[PDB]
């Protein structure tokens, strides 16, 4: 009876906060998704190059043998 009112806002008090806290989050999302998407996209780009670079470095050195190491076959 007189304890049924206390059962409502002991509960509600714990409820309101929950949602109010949910939104605080859900609101910052669009900015985090973007402010992340960016970092990602950079990181992606940066690494993307590094990989392509190494690949090529080794295409060079493994072709200088075809010109200098074949010349060793031409010099023997």
């Amino acid at each position: 009876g007189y304890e049924r009112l206390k059962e409502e806002l002991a509960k509600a008090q714990r409820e309101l906060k929950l949602k109010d806290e949910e939104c605080e989050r859900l609101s910052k999302v669009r900015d985090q998704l973007g402010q992340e998407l960016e970092e990602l996209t950079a990181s992606l780009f940066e690494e993307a190059h590094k990989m392509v670079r190494e690949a090529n470095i080794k295409q060079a050195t493994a072709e200088k043998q075809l010109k200098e190491a074949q010349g060793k076959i031409d010099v023997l």
């Binding site: 998704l33 992340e36 990602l40 992606l44 690494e47």
Partner: protein, 175 residues
Amino acid sequence: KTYDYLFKLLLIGDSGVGKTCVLFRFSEDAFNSTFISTIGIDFKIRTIELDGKRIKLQIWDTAGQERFRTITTAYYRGAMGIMLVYDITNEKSFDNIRNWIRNIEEHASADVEKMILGNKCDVNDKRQVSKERGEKLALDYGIKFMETSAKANINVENAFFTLARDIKAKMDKKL
């Protein structure tokens, strides 16, 4: 248009359980290069056929870094099937499988399809986790379990096709 379906999948777990090879073997790459190490995300596509239809699988592999916390939620929240992956060479990986199950339950959706993947089953001589004890974890949580070797190439293709069947059978139910 072909394909005619799109399942979005996720690989999650402790680092060095070999989440990333497990992928690289399914997607059929000839190579090792990945961004998991450095970035903590990588991604792979493979379409398969199941009972005749084309099914495009987008597979995200997540590595927890807090750096991209938001983005990787987006993957959890949007994922249709997620594979929890431990190393049978390593306990805590297995112990944590519960922990992840938290995340999955907490960050991900209410009907998601789930699968515990016991990886490296090939290297029995360094085997700390019994399979029997593996299956019990799974059964407790009412989820499928499967032992797997990214390197011996054991059950990886089956693990996926099994999870893909489980996703589709669920969707075909909502005809």
